[PDB]
Design a binder for this molecule. Sequence first.
Ligand code: CA
Ligand code: CA
Ligand code: CA
Ligand code: MG
Ligand code: MG
Ligand code: MG
Lengths: 605, 605, 605
Amino acid sequence: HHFADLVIQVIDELKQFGVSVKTYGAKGDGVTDDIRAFEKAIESGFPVYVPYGTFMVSRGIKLPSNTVLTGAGKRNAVIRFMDSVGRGESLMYNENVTTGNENIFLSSFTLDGNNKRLGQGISGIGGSRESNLSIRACHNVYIRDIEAVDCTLHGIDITCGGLDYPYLGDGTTAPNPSENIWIENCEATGFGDDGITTHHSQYINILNCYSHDPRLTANCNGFEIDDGSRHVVLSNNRSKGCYGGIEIKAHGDAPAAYNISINGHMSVEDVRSYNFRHIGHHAATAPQSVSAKNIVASNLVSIRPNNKRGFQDNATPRVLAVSAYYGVVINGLTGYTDDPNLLTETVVSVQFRARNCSLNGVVLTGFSNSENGIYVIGGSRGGDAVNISNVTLNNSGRYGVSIGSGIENVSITNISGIGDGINSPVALVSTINSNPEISGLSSIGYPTVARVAGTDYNDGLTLFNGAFRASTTSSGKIHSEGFIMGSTSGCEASVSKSGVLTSSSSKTSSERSLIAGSSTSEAKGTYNTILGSLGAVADEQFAALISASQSRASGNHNLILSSYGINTTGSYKVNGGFEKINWELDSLNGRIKARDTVTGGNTWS
Amino acid sequence: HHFADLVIQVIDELKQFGVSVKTYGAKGDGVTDDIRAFEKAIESGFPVYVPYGTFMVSRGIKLPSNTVLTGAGKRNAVIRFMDSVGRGESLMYNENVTTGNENIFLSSFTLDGNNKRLGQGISGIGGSRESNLSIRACHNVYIRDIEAVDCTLHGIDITCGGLDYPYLGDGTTAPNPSENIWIENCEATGFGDDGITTHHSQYINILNCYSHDPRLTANCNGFEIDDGSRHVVLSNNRSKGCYGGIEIKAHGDAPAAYNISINGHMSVEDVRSYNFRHIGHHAATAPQSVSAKNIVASNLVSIRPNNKRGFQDNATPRVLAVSAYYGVVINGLTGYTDDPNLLTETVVSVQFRARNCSLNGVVLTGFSNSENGIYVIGGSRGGDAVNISNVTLNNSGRYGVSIGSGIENVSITNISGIGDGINSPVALVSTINSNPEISGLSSIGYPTVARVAGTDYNDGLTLFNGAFRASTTSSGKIHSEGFIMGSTSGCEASVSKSGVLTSSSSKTSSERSLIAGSSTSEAKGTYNTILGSLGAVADEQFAALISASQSRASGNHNLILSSYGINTTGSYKVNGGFEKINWELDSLNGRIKARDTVTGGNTWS
Amino acid sequence: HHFADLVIQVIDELKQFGVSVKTYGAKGDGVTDDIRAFEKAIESGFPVYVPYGTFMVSRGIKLPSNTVLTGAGKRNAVIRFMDSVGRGESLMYNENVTTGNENIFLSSFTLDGNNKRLGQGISGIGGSRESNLSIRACHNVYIRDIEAVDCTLHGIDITCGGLDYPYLGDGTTAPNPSENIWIENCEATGFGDDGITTHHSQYINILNCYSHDPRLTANCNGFEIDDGSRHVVLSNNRSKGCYGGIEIKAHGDAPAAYNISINGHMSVEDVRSYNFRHIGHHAATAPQSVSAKNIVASNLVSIRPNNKRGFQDNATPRVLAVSAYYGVVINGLTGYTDDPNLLTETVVSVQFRARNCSLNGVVLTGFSNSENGIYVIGGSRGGDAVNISNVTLNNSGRYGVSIGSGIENVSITNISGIGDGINSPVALVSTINSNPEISGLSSIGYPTVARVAGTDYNDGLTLFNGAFRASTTSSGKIHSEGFIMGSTSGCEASVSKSGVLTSSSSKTSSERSLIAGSSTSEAKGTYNTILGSLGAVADEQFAALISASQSRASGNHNLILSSYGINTTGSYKVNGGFEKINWELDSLNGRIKARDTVTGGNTWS
Ligand SMILES: [Ca+2]
Ligand SMILES: [Ca+2]
Ligand SMILES: [Ca+2]
Ligand SMILES: [Mg+2]
Ligand SMILES: [Mg+2]
Ligand SMILES: [Mg+2]
């Protein structure tokens, strides 16, 4: 066969793809050990091509800097560990494990870790060892159209320098991150830990990948943005049959992933479709995470979340679970199930030190045997807020939106629900705290619409907090237990239980008071009333004026009526006058007094 | 040419791409029938490669399970029906039409259905027959970089088992769905029905595809998520010159697509850019769709929607049309036109049993001859809501945001509009119902800003519904026609037309009543007034107290003033006193009474 | 070597990829001029393939219509200008520079512009000349997996016909646009102007590209959507180390880009991550841009914005800067920094004639030495609005959300902030205007929560504008300085400072008035009070009625108490009666009158 060899030599020299591994002796026959051909091709300095075949390998494939490795495609070019391979190596990884490599471009092949060779139930022997593809401390890595199957640890792992993962504590940054990574159109399945994962690395885009069906039932996630990750975008990926669809977290002795964006995701039959947390920073008596911050997640799809496989000791399913994190913004979330018995606790939870979270544009459908649709619990932390808006629930949650203890600042707006198909529905909206801000509730089939600290509202509700002002373009100070309405400039209601209506330049510093229909008037005692008056002053307890001009009521329980230009000081007296006091009804002593006459037998014509 | 043949044999055995169809006798010369070479290559068990050429085929290409078929690229590897092919077959489809196949990976070629061969104006002969690519009942199918041209039926169709589409009625699930499908970077054009479409299948991602210019003018859509579809993501696709850009629907005797996500789309010169509907479930006298639920659509672009081509009997253009569906969430929509005469009815409609829909972050520009910007019509359904927020209109709609009949629950917030360039503008916002919730309206060039059930508001408007409470951290019950403001704990306003202001522990169950500036006071008759009082009770019709302490007014039209410690029961009497009644003004009989003296000739010094 | 030549001839005729440039004499040896082989291959009418090599070229590669040009991959197939090339040509461009070409498909190679050959600090000699890839006036162009390095002008430029850019003025459309362009998985770096840019062209998708590190420090942007662009989607791109991450703009003598969608982006260490502007249309005394309209941008990430490189004469960094544009909708924005000294002016600005902008779902973290988090300045324009909602700030901005002059319509809702780590924090929210609409503020570590036109609110605030109505399902007209609450149908409060509470069919047209607890009552003078009354009319200044039925008070300062069926007209009189006036307290003259008797010595038993 010397002629064929000569023809092949001519083809090899053409280098149509770069250099083929077969040029260096690779058989790709599913039997022969091709590791030396891969090593020789890779060290040559040429782009390396992997044609059709199953290329067996007796040890891991080490990648130097400036590597181009391209195959004929998934399930065409297949790279696979031999049955005889021992423990400790990922199938493919960059050669400099501690300080990393640069410019590595991998495309279009299957990595088959042959985990089967070890028997069933086995995961990685320690740290980041034994993934199908491990990238450690590398800059500029493009991973495209790679299928990762039968993986011992992870399918694809991006991590910092070192074989072990570092545990340096919260608020740290591990040395030698990977940086500028792109993972696109990859698939990971049959893995022991996670499908696609990042650790201690930054500037990463994960796009259009599919991670599904772990071998094991521990914390086995489709996409795991783990310890030390930051500045990562995930978009248009799918996860199926995992514990977490996308998990964003850290372990207790590590910094949480931060500044992570989910630009669309579809989670199919995961346990907790979207699961954001920081272990060790959940308890009320634990310190807040200093690292768990900034997640923006949009256009999230969750389908039939369940725990049929028994992941994580039968952890309860979730469409979304947020804990520990500050600053989580969720927009456009649809959760859907056709089986009410799969998820029966809480569809969406925001708990365990999660703070400053916002949910908007949520549709939850079919969770007709779950206790809660959305359930929020806080810690009474200063500067905290939870915002929930534009939510619709279709037979999802005995309590549709439930706010528990420790929440002082909550906004709940435009919530609607259908409860007719729910097993024993209770309330569309429930709060423990007495002062939620609420508007725009609509329901059918819930026996109670809103239950606010035990009080039911079934006919519509609008609740606002703090100093209130309406139909008034400017004013001075308004107390948080005060208001000004329908007024023009210059009004104030500066103490607890004080208010101004329909007035101009009128001020009250009177605890328990009302000024209405008045101008240039002032209340400054307590229990003061000023109505339809001009230049009126009430400056003693229970003093009041009605239809009075340029008058001052300074007596205890002293009321002035229908008067101009008088100042009164009497106790328990009603007075009237015009430039001088002209009559008195004396409640204290039972005297009636006129300046002029008192007469009976009168007529009014 | 025996030498060339030997060289070729050596090349074939190298299998650089897998196996070439030319190895099995394919000519790819645009004339010779290459079907047998395709069949032999495909049955061989190797990945199949299609090099440069136009590969003619006298019958459809049947795909078995575990097929890899890769070409040299669009407009490089071209697969085409011969002129002589008859009717009934799609150009490429999976072999097991009834129960399906698995693991099919198609990349990088053109499918030319040669519809031209049949003469003009022709579509598929029946059901799912005669698309360029038909996938029926398959699991795990990746379709990438395929260009579908001159298609008889659809470009790319994903469907359940069977050549016909099943019509099993609303609320059903057809047997043998396709599942786990990825369609990426594909193009469809010159089709008879739809470019890219799904039926009775689930877990599908359609990404970065371009569907444009149908041959026909029926219901010919760019992307059609049709009968029985569910759990589909579309992202970053473009449609051009179709009827619907993305249509999400079902026919009347089928279940509507449900739980569909649009993560960005661009629609160019379609008729109805985004068109969501369920035929047969639109009429007021028809049953609600049980299947039309859950659409989350974001970052939607609509450009110059028009019906120049006369699709669907000159159906009127739309940026967005929603009907039948429950739970549609739209966020980030820009509609733009440079020709006011293309769309003259309604830019965005939410009508025909659509319910529980939300629109947020909308910009509509240039629709200066359309009657309505956004037009919503409801059905007076329980638990319904329509939420419209953060909308800006630039010369778009004589009525900017219009709410028609059957809508009881509507929130309209932060709407702004410029109407100076509009042909005869009427109102930025109009509602038929008397109780919309409205705030944050801003306009120029509209003669009326808000028209609420016939009443105009041109100077700003804030409307809220239900029980109202402001500047009060806790309270007991508030009636839906009641309020509490500026108060501390323990207050109630529990009946129609009852209210508490600036008070503590004060309760009214009095229809037509007001308590203000008071403590521990109670109104329980009707027409009751309590002002600036402590421990005051008004418990008869028209009874009242002002500046009173520890007193009870129990008479008909009985008013107490400036008093301590009295209980009165007289009809049409004003009373005052201190531990005992001390004076009376008797309106009924015209008597004035003092306990002590009545005198004239008084002075106040 | 005649045998090798014969073998090669056989391989060439197989056309496995199309036609190789090596078939036409290309060496790809990094030295030999291969331009003639490229020209001959390209003119042949076959798809052209570029295998492994560095292919040197002594002049630009001209592309005709219907070109397919595919390489072996980035850093595999490399196309490069020779050192000796002069000035004036882009490395690759379509042949018909003035009226354009169609159907051009470019994939999988590096373009190396060899800008180095000119010495350092050099950019393009004029207009659109000397980019790595220039597309002028073309329809249907797909650019995929192209790496553009060492570029003289831009990496990839899409423009209209002509070598120069046209400057036709605002509101124009340049002839011969490019149309239907797709740029995907491309990289641009080491460019003189912009990485990837569009001019005077439409229907463009830019997806998953990476633009970084310009050579120069002028207006050198990652992605520049420039002069004349429209209908462009950018999604899942990354920019790093540029001036603008994504710039959307125009120069002064050109139309601004319009109707642009950003469906997710990550900006790393740019100066102004997102920078939208129209030069020449920013000044208060300049005309508004007629073209700068419609930007919808979502899921935006900004990381460590800074100006360490000194771009644009040390322009100050921004997460987001909006100017000139109408109708900008931002949803889901996270800005993050770990270095407080990089950005010290304003994190997010909306200024310089930007109008009708909305921000929602914003998290800003780490900007602890910046003066402002969000800073908005307007122009007092009619129909303008700025909407800011669901914002959380983590040690970002001495003023968290600041509203400056010229803003009449602002909505600020659900803002929370932590200020404890800020260098001298001032206020979470500050406004210059007296009438912002505000609710849902929460903070810790800011000395003031809200400062509204100089007045501080630290204990919560709810402010609404315009006519106000609550707990009332229908009403007649309400003045913008009026209100109706807790009422049933038929009420009106039609003038400044008029209000109705807890009433039915009661109307006030009385300036400075209040009706409460009443039915069928009417106030129509001024300074009118009607309380707990039925069929009561107050129609003179300071007239009032309390606990009155079927009575009319028509006197100046005339009050009726505890009465039925009387009409009074006296000045400064309190009256009561039953079908006739029965008593009077005359404040004017100091007379007390009874119809019947006046007596002392009374008891009430
Ligand atoms: Ca894990
Ligand atoms: Ca159709
Ligand atoms: Ca530039
Ligand atoms: Mg991990
Ligand atoms: Mg159909
Ligand atoms: Mg430019």
